[PDB]
Structures are given as structure tokens and as C-alpha cells.
Amino acid sequence: ARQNLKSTDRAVQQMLDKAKREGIQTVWDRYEAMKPQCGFGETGLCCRHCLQGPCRINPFGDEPKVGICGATAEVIVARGLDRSIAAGAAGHSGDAKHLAHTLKKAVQGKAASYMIKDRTKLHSIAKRLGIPTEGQKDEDIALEVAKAALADFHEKDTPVLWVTTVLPPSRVKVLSAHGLIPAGIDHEIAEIMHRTSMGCDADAQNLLLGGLRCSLADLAGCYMGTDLADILFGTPAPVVTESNLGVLKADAVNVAVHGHNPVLSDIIVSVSKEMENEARAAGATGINVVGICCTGNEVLMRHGIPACTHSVSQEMAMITGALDAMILDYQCIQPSVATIAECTGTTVITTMEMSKITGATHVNFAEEAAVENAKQILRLAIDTFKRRKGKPVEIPNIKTKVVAGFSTEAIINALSKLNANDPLKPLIDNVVNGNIRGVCLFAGCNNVKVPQDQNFTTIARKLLKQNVLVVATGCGAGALMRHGFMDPANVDELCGDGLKAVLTAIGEANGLGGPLPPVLHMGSCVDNSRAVALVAALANRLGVDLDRLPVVASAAEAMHEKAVAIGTWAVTIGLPTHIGVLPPITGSLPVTQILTSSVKDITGGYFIVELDPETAADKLLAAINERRAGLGLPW
């Protein structure tokens, strides 16, 4: 079998060979077994919103042409897309809500394992929300910030402040004029579910305006999530670590943290250090915490925990035979891991009441009992490592060097070595003179339909040669880190002369043997909000709105409903937004035209749907260069 058609990651290819000869079914095998997939669903032309269904519409030809209730293709497509945005919003904001309750508990004395770690961040958030700090205790400031976070989930006298206080006033003004500012995060999710139910909203433009507003609720959830985690766990600064399956170690207890919420994994990290000697006694060198998906990104950014794999290839960590435990909370966890665990000997542990997997061991995690629960979990991992004594494992000897931890604050600090009191100016200077063509954010997942990482790396390589400053989050950062894009030793090979000069100048001014890495890792998926903060700060420094800046986003291999919500709010805040996988919209030309074209007249952003990555790179460059020409810059 040609494993490079499944993944461009050589360590993943090696594990696919091992899974094949051991007879362990993979996500790629389940994909093959699903082909050919349903064309009504692929195009968006299916509706199950009531029990008169299921209804479908032929993309071309004869009947059925319309849903049983009269719903058109346009309504059906818009309604399905709207529910996906609401679902993504519900995940990101459920993540943030957990962080909000955790911060509240922490400063109320209910969970001593948690504390205010970043006082500076606490105060800057309180100030941005209009929460007075002068004369207040940190605990009381934090209490107020947690209360404001929870208040943004419902209607109140103010709109969602994690939208209106994080975007430039001019952007908020154009969104308010279209009625797009969310009134409450869960309020908007519920309204989507209402308006998309049978016999309700049946106008594509009305429905899609609702989706834009719900995407801003998703953005608020992301930004709140990043804010609260930085308070609780620290704002990331530049770190050095490694990535890919070669970060596992046969002689250690290998513990993957997988899912999204750092309330769990940050505790695993610190507790695993406390139990090192208990692990030495079981015959291990120690506990080797490694990261998968966003929760791994979280502990990579803050602690330098090596990333072992991401997204579509998550099963391959287990296939090595050396993964003793996989500790889960929620989101983007293939449920197959619970059945594969029986073949690989991995102990799979769920921790969240609303995210169980049949066959997995459930260990309830309560923030009030975080250390005790973590030790109960890590002891299951040690028992498992003992059980594989004298078993051979196959860990591919494949890893990359990863410089990461580029929070927006860290980026501002790095630039400040070139201009202390105007740190954004050196970046803008080099945009203006052409050393930086523009900025591209890579975000989102892998998708089994796309050879793993192929779009991310193909697009990134073209952009970097054209002097684009590339930043990345989530499993887009995962793809780029696993292929060397976060190793500064690759600046010469990857970057155009102008971008190299800039990365080198900044790196030299920060006391480094050389340049920043080719791609700046800005964090998890909620940390797409960091890219927003940076671009908003650039917008404010220049006196223009985001839809005039040479900034684009690419969800190059998108999968999750969360990635659709992110892409939609990237469009809503004004960015040309590439998506490298077909969302289910092509069954409706009017919807596609709204999302790819007429939405420009509303928010200035627009979707770029392009499945061929070389073509996508050209379209993203043209989008960047059209912005440059709109600022009167050469390009």
C-alpha cells in the first residue's frame, strides 16, 4: 500500500505499515470503507430537521427539487451550515465556560491546585473589560473577570464583551450596523437551533447573517478561553521542544494528553513531575508526558511538552505499542481509540462527565480534587507500563525541532528589541518596504480526505518564498511543526530573502544565534484569538480596519465544526479566508456566492474555497497583494 497517499508524515507512514500487518483498522481504513460518500450530504442537499424527512435535493436533473415542507436548496444549505457554526461555537465556548468556572473556584478557595499565575494578564484583561483594578485584590479582580466571562453567555444590558472589547471600534461599528454583534454566546447558539428548525427561518441571506453573528459568539468563546487559560496557567513565551512520534521513549511511562482543555492537562504535567520516583520504581526512567491535538498544543506552548502527533493520525501514537495512557477530556478524539486500546495495551481514560467513550476507563476529574485525580490517573498509566515489560515497541525514530510559544505578547516583546516604544512599527516598516509581503494564519485540523499535511506544507512553502510572515495554530501548527517549519535552521531553505532578513534581524535582537523560526506557532485553536489580537493591534496602530490589512487565513485541511466556526468569524472580522476542503455548500450557488463574494460588501472578508493547494497559494497571494495595492504599496 502507498502510505504517502494517506499521510506525508514519515512517522505516520511507518505506523500505518505496522497497523496494516497487525490488522488494526485505522481512520484511513474506515474512510476507504465509506467510499463513495453520499453526494447529497457532500453538497449540503440533505435535511433531517423533522420527522417528515429525510429530505434531499438532486444537485442537477429532475425531482426532488425541494424539501417536503417547501425548503429550497438555499435554505437547506444555509440551515445546515448554521447548525455547524452553532456546534463549533458550543465547543469553543463550553471550553471557555469550564475555564471560567475553574478560575472562579480557584479564587474562592475551592480548588487550591489552581491559582492566578499571570497577574499582568489578569489586570490587562480587567482593564480591557472596564473592570477597575485600582485598589482591588487580585482575587476580587479575578472573581469579577470570571463573572464577566460567564455573563457573556446570556443576554444582558451589554452585548458580548469578548467581541466588542477585542475588535477595533470601526470593525464593531460595521458589524453592529448589520446586526451581527452577538447578544450572548449560548443565546446565539440556541437562536441558531431555533431559526434552523422546521418551518422557521427560510431566507438564505437572513440565515447566513445569523451564522456570521453566531461565528462571532465562537470567536468570543475562543478569546475568553485564551484569556482565562493565560491567567490560570501563564501567557506563553518562546520555548524549544520537539514533535512527532519519536518523542515517545520505550523506557519511560508514555502519557499522551489529548483533547482541548488545559484545566486537566496542565495538572497532569506538574503532577507527573511529582511522581517521577514512583515511576522509577516501576522500572521506568520517568513519566514522559507528550501532547496530541489542542491540549498538547496548550502544554507545548506553556511548558515545552513535546507534541507526539495530531488530528487525523492520533491513532498512530497507540500503534507504536509504547503509549501507556491516553488522557482525554473532549473534542476531536476519535472514539476508535477506545477499541484500539485493547489491541495496543494503551489505557484510555475519559475525565469529563459529558464526554465518555464506551470501553474507556472513566476517572472523574474534579478541579477541587485535581491532584488526587491526576495521581489516580497516572497510577493507571504506571500499571500499564509495567504490563508491557519485555514487549517490543516500534517508535519511529523521527522527530523535528520546534521553537514555539509565540503568544501575541511574546511577538510584541520580540519586535520591541528593534523599537522599544513602538514595537509594531518594525513589522509595519517591513510590510511597507516589501520585506514582508503580508501575514497568513494557518488554522484548523487535518481531514482524512486530504493526504495529511499536504495542503498545509504546500501552501506554506509558496507563501514563505514570497516573503509572507506565516503564523499557525492548532493542528495547522501541528502539521507545520512535524515537517520542520518551526526549526530556525530551515530559514535559509524555506524563506524569501526579505522574510529571512526580517526573521534574522528580530532573532539577532533577541540574543539568538540566528533568526526566528520560519513559522510562528501561536497556540491551540482557541488561540486563533491571539492572531486576532495581533492583527487588531496592527489595525489600531495603522488607523485602519482589518479588511484593509494584507492578512489572510487558511483552514487548509479543515474537519471539525469548530473549524467552520473559526473560518466564518475570520470572514466576519474582515479576512480573506481559504478553506481547503469542500464545506457542504456547493449544492447552492446563491449560498456559495454569498459566502465567497457578496459577503465582501458586508464584512470585507470572504471565503476562498480551493481544494488544490498550489492554486490556493496563488489565490491567497493575490488576496494579500490586492490588500497591499489598496494601501498604495508595491507588490
Q: How far, rounded to the nearest angstrom, does the alpha carbon of residue 241 sit from its chain's CA centroid?
A: 19
For residue 159 the three cell numbers come to 452585548
> Is 343 annotated as belonging to a binding site?
no
Least distance between ligand SF4 and beta carbon 54 (Å): 6
- Cell matching residue 373: 485525580
Q: How many CA atoms lie within 13 A of 432 on its CB side?
A: 8
Calpha distance 106→54 (Å, rounded): 48
CB of 75 to a second copy, least distance (A): 7
Residue 47 annotated as lining a ligand binding site: yes
Query: What's the closest the beta carbon of residue 424 comes to ligand SF4, in angstroms?
Result: 40
**DSSP per-residue string spanning 454-504:** HHHHHHHHHHHHTTEEEEEEHHHHHHHHHTTTT-GGGHHHHS-HHHHHHHH
> Of 166, 289, 303, 291, whose CA–CA distance to 234 is shortest?
303
What gap in Å lies between CA 220 and CA 88, rounded to an integer?
A: 12
Cis peptide before 236 (omega within 30 of 0): no
Answer with the entry of ligand FES, a second copy, Fe ion, none that 525 interacts with (C-beta below 5 to 8 A by kind).
Fe ion
Nearer to a second copy, 200 or 369 (CB): 200
49 labelled ligand-binding: no
**323 has which bridge partners?**
254
- Give residues in contact with ligand SF4 (CB under 6 A): 47-50, 52-53, 55, 67-69, 71, 198
Rank residues 378 and 608 by Cβ distance to a second copy and give the closer one: 608
Between helices 528-542 and 204-233, what is the axis angle to 10°?
A: 100
Q: List Cβ neighbours of 211 (8 Å cut-off, separation of 6 or more).
A: 78, 81, 82, 85, 192, 568
Does 54 bind ligand FES (CB under 6 A)? Our answer is yes
Least distance from C-beta 282 to a second copy, angstroms?
30
Crossing angle of the two packed helices 528-542 and 408-416, in degrees rounded to 10: 50
606 near ligand FES (CB under 6 A): no
Nine cell digits for residue 130 = 472596564
Cell numbers standing for residue 472: 499557525
Cβ proximity to ligand FES, 54 vs 630, nearer residue: 54
Task: Please check if 310 is assigned to a binding site.
Answer: no
CB of 459 to ligand FES, least distance (A): 30
Cβ-count burial of 75 within 10 angstroms (0-12 exposed, 13-18 middle, 19+ buried)? Answer: buried
SS (HEC) of 271-331? HHHHCHHHHHHCCCCCEEEEEEHHHHHHHHHHHCCCEEECHHHHHHHHHCCCEEEEEECCC
State in angstroms the smallest separation of the CB of 624 from a second copy.
25
Least Å from the CB of residue 257 to ligand SF4: 22
The reply, when asked if residue 332 is annotated as ligand binding, is yes
Q: Which of 38, 366, 369, 589 binds ligand FES (CB under 6 A)?
A: 38
Q: Is 46 annotated as a binding residue?
A: yes
| DSSP H or E stretch at residue 151 | helix 138-151
Displacement of CA 333 from its chain's centroid (Å): 14
Question: Which one of the spans 36-44, 409-417, 586-594, 623-631 is the region binding ligand FES (CB under 6 A)?
Answer: 36-44
> Residue 67 CB, nearest distance to ligand FES (Å)?
12
Residue closer to a second copy by CB (options 494, 570) is 570
Using alpha carbons only, give the angle 546, 573, 554 rounded to the nearest 5 degrees: 90
Nearer to ligand SF4, 73 or 290 (CB): 73
What is the DSSP-derived secondary structure letter of residue 246?
G
User: Residue 98 touches which of a second copy, ligand SF4, Fe ion, none (CB < 5 to 8 A by kind)?
Assistant: none
Nearer to a second copy, 285 or 364 (CB): 364
> One-letter amino acid identity for 253?
V
Applying CB under 6 A, does 40 fall inside the site for ligand FES?
yes
- Cβ distance to ligand FES smaller for residue 56 or 628: 56
Distance CA 590, CA 571 (A): 17
Residue 439, phi then psi, degrees to nearest 5: -125, 130
Interface of this chain with Fe ion, residues 283 to 302, rule: CB under 5 A:
294
Distance of CA 218 to the CA centre of its chain: 12
Least distance CB 544 / a second copy (angstroms): 31
Q: How far is the CB of 208 from ligand SF4 (least distance, A)?
A: 18
Least separation in angstroms between residue 474's CB and Fe ion is: 5
Question: For the range 346-349, what are the long-range contacts, defined as Cβ-Cβ under 8 Å and sequence gap of 24 or more?
Answer: 346/318, 346/384, 347/380, 347/381, 347/383, 347/384, 349/325, 349/377, 349/380
The answer to whether residue 56 forms part of the interface with ligand FES (CB under 6 A) is: yes
294/436 with CB nearer Fe ion: 294
User: Could you tell which of ligand SF4, a second copy, ligand FES, none binds residue 633, using a CB distance below 5 to 8 A set by kind?
Assistant: none
Could you say which of a second copy, ligand FES, ligand SF4, none residue 356 binds, taking C-beta under 5 to 8 angstroms by partner kind?
a second copy
Q: Is residue 525 a contact point for Fe ion (CB under 5 A)?
A: yes
Q: Which of Fe ion, ligand SF4, a second copy, none interacts with 150 (beta carbon under 5 to 8 A by kind)?
A: a second copy
Query: Of 181, 186, 190, 130, which is closest to residue 160 (Cα–Cα)?
Result: 181
Q: Which does 69 bind (CB under 5 to 8 A by kind): ligand SF4, Fe ion, ligand FES, none?
A: ligand SF4
From 12, 15, 16, 46, residue interacting with ligand FES (rule: CB under 6 A): 46
Closer of 53 and 498 to ligand SF4 (Cβ): 53
**Residue numbering of the annotated binding site for [Ni-4Fe-5S] cluster:** 260, 294, 332, 445, 475, 525
**Residue numbering of the annotated binding site:** 38, 46-47, 50, 55, 69, 260, 294, 332, 445, 475, 525
**Residue numbering of the annotated binding site for [4Fe-4S] cluster:** 38, 46-47, 50, 55, 69
Q: Give contact residues for Fe ion (rule: CB under 5 A).
A: 294, 525
Q: Give contact residues for ligand FES (rule: CB under 6 A).
A: 38, 40-41, 46, 54, 56
